[PDB]
Amino acid sequence: SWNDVFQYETNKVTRIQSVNYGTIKWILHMTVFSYVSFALMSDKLYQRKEPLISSVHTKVKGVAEVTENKLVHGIFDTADYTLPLQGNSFFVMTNYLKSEGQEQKLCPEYPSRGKQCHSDQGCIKGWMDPQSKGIQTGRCIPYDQKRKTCEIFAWCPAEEGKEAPRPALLRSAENFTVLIKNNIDFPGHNYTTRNILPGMNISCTFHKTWNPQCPIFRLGDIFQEIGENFTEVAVQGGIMGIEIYWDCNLDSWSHRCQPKYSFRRLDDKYTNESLFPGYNFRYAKYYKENGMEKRTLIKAFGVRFDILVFGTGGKFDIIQLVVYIGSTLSYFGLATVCIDLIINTYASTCCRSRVYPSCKCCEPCAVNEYYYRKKCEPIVEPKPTLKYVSFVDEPHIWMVDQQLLGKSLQDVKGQEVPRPQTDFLELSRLDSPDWCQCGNCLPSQLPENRRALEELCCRRKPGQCITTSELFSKIVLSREALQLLLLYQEPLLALEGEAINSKLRHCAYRSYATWRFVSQDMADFAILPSCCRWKIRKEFPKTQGQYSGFKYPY
Amino acid sequence: SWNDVFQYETNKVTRIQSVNYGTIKWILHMTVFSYVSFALMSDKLYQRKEPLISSVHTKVKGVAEVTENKLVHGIFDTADYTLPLQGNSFFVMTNYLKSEGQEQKLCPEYPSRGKQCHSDQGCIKGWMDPQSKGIQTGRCIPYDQKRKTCEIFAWCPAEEGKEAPRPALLRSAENFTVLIKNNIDFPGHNYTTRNILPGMNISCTFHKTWNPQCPIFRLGDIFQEIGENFTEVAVQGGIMGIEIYWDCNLDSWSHRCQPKYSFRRLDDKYTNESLFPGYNFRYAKYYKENGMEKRTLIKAFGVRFDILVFGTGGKFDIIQLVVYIGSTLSYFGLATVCIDLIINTYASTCCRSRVYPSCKCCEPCAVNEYYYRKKCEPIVEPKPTLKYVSFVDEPHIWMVDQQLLGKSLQDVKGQEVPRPQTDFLELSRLDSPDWCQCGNCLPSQLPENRRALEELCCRRKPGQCITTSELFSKIVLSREALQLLLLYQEPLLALEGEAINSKLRHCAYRSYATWRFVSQDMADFAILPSCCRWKIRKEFPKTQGQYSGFKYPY
Amino acid sequence: SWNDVFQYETNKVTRIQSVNYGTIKWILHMTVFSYVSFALMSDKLYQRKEPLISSVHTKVKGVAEVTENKLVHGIFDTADYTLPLQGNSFFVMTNYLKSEGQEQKLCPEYPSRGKQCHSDQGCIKGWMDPQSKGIQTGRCIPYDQKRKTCEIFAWCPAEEGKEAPRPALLRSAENFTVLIKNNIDFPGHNYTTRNILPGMNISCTFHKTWNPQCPIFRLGDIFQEIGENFTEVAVQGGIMGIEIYWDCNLDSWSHRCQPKYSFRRLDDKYTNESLFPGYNFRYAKYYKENGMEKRTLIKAFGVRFDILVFGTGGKFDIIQLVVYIGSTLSYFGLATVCIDLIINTYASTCCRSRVYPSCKCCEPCAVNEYYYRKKCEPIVEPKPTLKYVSFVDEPHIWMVDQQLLGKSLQDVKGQEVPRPQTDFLELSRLDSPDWCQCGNCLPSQLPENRRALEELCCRRKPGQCITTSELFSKIVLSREALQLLLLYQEPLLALEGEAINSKLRHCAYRSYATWRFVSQDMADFAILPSCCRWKIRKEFPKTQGQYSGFKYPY
Ligand SMILES: O=C(NCC1(N2CCN(c3ccccc3)CC2)CCOCC1)c1cccnc1Sc1ccccc1
Ligand SMILES: O=C(NCC1(N2CCN(c3ccccc3)CC2)CCOCC1)c1cccnc1Sc1ccccc1
Ligand SMILES: O=C(NCC1(N2CCN(c3ccccc3)CC2)CCOCC1)c1cccnc1Sc1ccccc1
Ligand SMILES: Nc1nc2c(ncn2[C@@H]2O[C@H](COP(=O)(O)OP(=O)(O)O)[C@@H](O)[C@H]2O)c(=O)[nH]1
Ligand SMILES: Nc1nc2c(ncn2[C@@H]2O[C@H](COP(=O)(O)OP(=O)(O)O)[C@@H](O)[C@H]2O)c(=O)[nH]1
Ligand SMILES: Nc1nc2c(ncn2[C@@H]2O[C@H](COP(=O)(O)OP(=O)(O)O)[C@@H](O)[C@H]2O)c(=O)[nH]1
Ligand SMILES: *[C@@H]1O[C@H](CO)[C@@H](O)[C@H](O)[C@H]1NC(C)=O
Ligand SMILES: *[C@@H]1O[C@H](CO)[C@@H](O)[C@H](O)[C@H]1NC(C)=O
Ligand SMILES: *[C@@H]1O[C@H](CO)[C@@H](O)[C@H](O)[C@H]1NC(C)=O
Ligand SMILES: *[C@@H]1O[C@H](CO)[C@@H](O)[C@H](O)[C@H]1NC(C)=O
Ligand SMILES: *[C@@H]1O[C@H](CO)[C@@H](O)[C@H](O)[C@H]1NC(C)=O
Ligand SMILES: *[C@@H]1O[C@H](CO)[C@@H](O)[C@H](O)[C@H]1NC(C)=O
Ligand code: NA
Ligand SMILES: [Zn+2]
Ligand SMILES: [Zn+2]
Ligand SMILES: [Zn+2]
Ligand SMILES: [Zn+2]
Ligand SMILES: [Zn+2]
Ligand SMILES: [Zn+2]
Structure with missing residues (x-):
């Protein structure tokens, strides 16, 4: 309880002194860091971005001389051609059709x-x-x-239906100017600015290059900056957008909140005649003449100028930075993933069989087998069906995971596993059965249903029994060695009774299993051959009982 | 320096050949991948989204016949009932109260x-x-x-205060049509489109199902699509919103930027009479009659149509995709976390004591103990108070982490730790003190303040001393074996002087500690019993000095 | 194939029973969790945020008495001073200049x-x-x-150019009221609300503290809330913003969607006289007098009130929460990273040499060496140049990674590596060459180009040869031990022919390498001294062949 809480688990690691892998790891780390930093700087992902709230105030300057037909020569000032800004748009009349003295009555259309x-x-x-x-x-x-x-x-x-006069009566409107005052605010960031600051000169007119910050725009200049002809558009009118983009950085160390002006025609040039091309509206001036209520209808064509103000204000936010860093942290495992994949792939035996002979250049990559055997410890699930057998004639061990449905284990033929390398440091000291192939195996005394478990020979093919080897007597059948092992496990063990024989048998089984399988994991589920089993059992006979045989540890 | 930089650390892993764990891992990986991909596709988290900037141009078509009381029959055209679009809203007069010939003077209210x-x-x-x-x-x-x-x-x-005429004089406005032209732009994505494209027919009128893309709307249709009655709203007026939603995908392979039209009443139906229900405004037409300045006040009730244009344009952005993938990468550790939790929980001994007998179904999950012992290597913090003791009578080892405040170590009674399994592969070769319980322990010669450290017996209960075991002489008191170990460590060691006895004593202590504790980590802080200690010390007596005893390695 | 898919890899871990490390780990985990939860709650990062679409409807109430010069006393009602809301702004006239009876003709400016x-x-x-x-x-x-x-x-x-009258004629406009009705919608969340709900009293007027939710605003109150003087602004006019902020939470359990009202002057106070300070527009009333077309020009100064409505609606989104949790998951590795860094730093030997003597307080942190040696297993890349040598006089081993360009290995002098600690549990059983320093080394019989490989002495300095040690005969030159090892590896090995001598030689080399290097990784690339090599080779002479010597395993 108390102790379990005060614990720290750290991963076991193998450190490889490799030039190539270290270089690859550092290259990948630097690449990931560079991309992550570049993205953070470019998209300002450390900044919280707030949309702006804008207010626009426009003022049109200009007078137009208009001559029409007696011959009437007049001048139009702002009150005669301008519709005051409403929302964020202003209208300049460029042409008009006049119908004076209208009465509600009958007439031909x-x-x-x-x-x-x-x-x-x-x-x-x-x-x-x-x-x-x-x-x-x-x-x-x-x-x-x-x-x-x-x-x-x-x-x-x-x-109605009369065509707009051509040329446009208020052509001179191309020479009109508009002063645009734009106030913007980011309320979340509690910042506000405007497009006009102290220092500017009124004698300026906007230019993309020379005067990109002058908020005074000639209408004809607006049109010709984006390849539009004011003279033609003036006849039937149109809609032009003055876009004001505020890409604003509100950090003190990188403060930059300036407007960028641009222009875009908003009315389709090729609108179908049925869809009311251009821009016009009909304005009625009602009055009384004699005893008759009349009206002067002006179909005013002109350019509606929509002032479009958009942008974001960015200010450093610690939470945004933290979220971005957390999002990108997992990319720093790329080096480990790639190098581990390399080690896994170049550890396969196939590479030596096929790939290396074809491409001898990739031969030095065989060192990945050592890395993999130093990094990975395979283990199999321990289940009752799990058995290991070893044949002295063969050099490897065989793992059987399939139930024995009456077929002798000698014939059941599981997969092949290599025998582990023994610790050389520890080794620096001094009517036979049909399935048998050595002449020493005896029929199993276990119940028939599970008799096939013990139906195993020390070798697959005929030959000398492993029991005849000199090492078998010393490792397995030496009573002195088994007694010494018993004392090592139980120093005060009493060598009396019928249990001593059982203990010696168990230790002899363990000794053979360790000798012929090395690994304790494989030795625990190993199966002794009948010959060695019965030699052990007769060296230490059981008096008045029946041998139980191998049992599942779990 | 140079070598330390060229290093790669890889985690040591145990690979389990388990059907259930592999299946669980793959199921969880596929589940995580599927959810992450689904979220990415559904929310287009690979896309950067930009709000649109919109321009709206409206045109109302229709004429209303109005008869009032002499009997006056007239017609209203757009100039007589329409307020031109300003911002993004247009007004259609549906009713009016007229007060002609007003003079600034005295009158009854x-x-x-x-x-x-x-x-x-x-x-x-x-x-x-x-x-x-x-x-x-x-x-x-x-x-x-x-x-x-x-x-x-x-x-x-x-x-003022006169009620709006009922029925509404401009009822026929329900049959008026409005053409709405909507230009939208995403400037960040440099994309622009409009709600009217070549191919459309002017003979269309909008319908939710038949003509959902026709931008020509009958006002009465607008009202009846959302269960509003134009005839009733016409009396006092109202505010209706025409919502234009642009859910636009600007990727070439998934390009879809079309408007969706919807309608929503914006004025509260049940506004209190004191809060000016409906929508109206007062318009004054000033003129001169005789020598008197007069005005005709029109209280115009009608529907203000607010055109609401909103939406986002999504375009693939590599940084957004990278950030999303990084954010979701850590979810792929779910399988490892879950399987490790399973292994940890089913490794506990409690499960066998209580859970398994109650639920025998979960018995095969005992294999998790093997996985845990193959995955985790417990180690304790090495501190001066750390001691290990072993009693031959007992089968386990005891760890003492508490200072000995004069109490004999035999009685201080720390926790219990299991004795590690010995390497069977390596074992394939050939006036007694009151606290004592074997008759061989002697009083410690150390200073009193630290005398309790050595006050330890080989056993907790009376019995034969471990020293009497045969293995004790060979492992510990065999001079030949200790000399062989010395040579193994120091091949050219000179067996002369008083240091040879000290070295043999140290090796005998190490041999007993390794034998009775196996683990080197436990053997390093093990404490020898007084009996074995003094037997070793008399086998190799110190000539002209005082034994120092156990010392803290760190 | 099938088996490879059904595998689960789990990391090997060392569990440390440390109070300090467990405490640090839990403190860091709790800190990370607390910050992550705080950020999630504060920024509602579990919520998807949608911008609102707004509709504003305004109504101005008030009458102004104006007296001017005969003496003319009149009253202005809403139709005489108000411009109806267009977009989201309304204008209130506060001053005016009148020019009556204008004719298009010649005049002095x-x-x-x-x-x-x-x-x-x-x-x-x-x-x-x-x-x-x-x-x-x-x-x-x-x-x-x-x-x-x-x-x-x-x-x-x-x-034109006449100054605005002072004091402002419509001063009384400060006492006018405006009712603002604001409808807002979040269409993605399908939510809509308005700033007026049942229960409010019309007898309210807005106050920041007493009536912060009353949508009825006195204009003078608007000005004096933010330290602006209505009387002064009335002369030349201005632009005021009524900001309506909707910070709306649309979750049922935390539902809060209320407007916050604020005020901000939008026109620059200190606009240059050339830049049209204030706010005014010119309105023309055209009429006919006698046979002359005339117009009354009103330069109307006043306050344009811009109603600015902004805000976001947040609603729980599972994908947003999942993305945030994924982004923050990697921060929970902070404890592991920090503790591993501590272990790595305090494992260095330098700390004991310099840091600890200077700061004895940090002495108990030496236990990190044990943790590091229990956590990390260093391994070097196996390459043909890799060799290990051991000198009996010296206590350590030497690793040589450099090619021998004719220089004897005895002099090539690679780096120093420690000899691993031997398994004590396994050890519980029973005309000389110029470069030589022991009198037993013989010249190598290998080709000259690679003769320097075998030009190695058992010791760096003159002394007794390691071959003279007693352990050398038993470990290396004992035929019985080598035969026993052969039988252990190959129980049925035939001790006949010339191959038995070669096998004994190989096992003797392995035994010496294991004895003098312990580690199998170092023993595999170890180099035997010439003296021991030739003693082994004469104990088991090769009959009719040439010794091949050391070969690269990979
Ligand atoms: O009437 C004429 N122009 C005035 C326009 N608006 C009227 C409405 N005003 C307005 C201002 C504020 C609030 C609400 C409303 C703005 C100005 C007509 C509509 O389109 C823009 C200009 C007009 C046209 C064509 C030939 N003549 C004449 S009048 C004239 C007579 C003699 C000499 C010169 C001009
Ligand atoms: O005057 C009347 N209607 C014109 C309205 N506005 C005026 C201002 N115009 C306008 C246009 C552009 C820029 C700036 C301003 C738009 C149109 C009145 C306000 O509400 C919308 C319609 C009106 C009402 C009720 C009975 N009669 C009559 S006049 C009439 C006389 C005889 C026969 C028919 C109508
Ligand atoms: O004409 C005067 N005031 C009316 C204003 N607008 C006109 C246009 N209307 C309007 C409404 C709806 C749609 C389109 C347009 C709104 C109201 C003038 C422009 O600025 C705001 C007020 C005015 C000024 C200064 C002295 N006198 C008088 S008239 C008067 C005469 C005698 C007594 C009192 C006032
Ligand atoms: N690995 C392994 N262990 C065995 C084998 N046969 C018996 N044992 C072990 O020996 C013990 C059974 O004892 P046994 O000598 O067969 O007869 P018993 O006296 O009736 O128990 C069990 O704990 C088994 O683990 C075998 O073939 N392989
Ligand atoms: N593990 C362990 N080591 C011991 C014990 N007693 C002595 N030693 C070791 O023996 C060394 C001390 O030598 P010692 O034989 O007691 O007498 P000395 O000749 O004065 O040094 C120290 O390095 C100890 O680590 C013990 O009880 N347990
Ligand atoms: N580690 C190590 N192995 C050696 C050395 N010399 C020879 N061997 C091993 O002995 C084998 C070569 O056999 P050797 O006894 O030299 O003569 P051979 O009969 O011609 O092969 C090789 O597999 C080497 O790995 C050495 O100096 N160090
Ligand atoms: C604009 O001004 C220039 C220079 O005063 C003049 O040449 C030109 O004719 C003007 N444009 C129109 C349409 O009057
Ligand atoms: C603009 O259009 C007019 C027609 O109104 C034409 O005379 C003139 O040449 C055009 N200008 C350009 C540059 O195309
Ligand atoms: C709308 O038009 C239909 C068909 O012309 C007509 O029956 C109906 O009366 C009209 N509505 C009004 C209010 O006049
Ligand atoms: C609409 O309202 C009018 C009253 O102006 C009423 O006569 C008519 O029945 C209503 N229509 C519906 C469908 O409710
Ligand atoms: C506003 O109203 C108060 C109280 O009726 C009055 O004292 C004050 O003079 C008024 N302001 C103006 C400018 O008339
Ligand atoms: C507001 O300005 C007027 C001038 O029109 C001045 O008389 C008055 O004192 C000012 N009020 C304040 C509070 O400054
Ligand atoms: Na992560
Ligand atoms: Zn057999
Ligand atoms: Zn056999
Ligand atoms: Zn005792
Ligand atoms: Zn004892
Ligand atoms: Zn030599
Ligand atoms: Zn030598």
């Missing part, structure tokens, strides 16, 4: 797009024409001497 | 909500009534034959 | 800022003055009896 009538059949009665802006009476009447148009109750004289 | 006066006391003088829109004079005068209302200096005839 | 003319030279002809708002004719004419100003074709009488 203007002949637009060949809207001629030859009979009263074509003209419906009671039909509200949104183009003509009147109610048809069902009659066709002469609009002039030659052509006739459907009659309508409307504001008369009706002139 | 309109009797609204029973605003009657019976005496001059109720009518204050100089009071500016924002409802009546005039200055009270303090007098109560007859507004008509029967009822009287307070006098005010105001625009007269004053009609 | 108003004498503003001393715009006097003394000769026709100063007055250009055809010059469009945007300040005077007329076309100069090139003549200088008397504007009055004393001063003269340039003639212009313009709307006359021209009064």
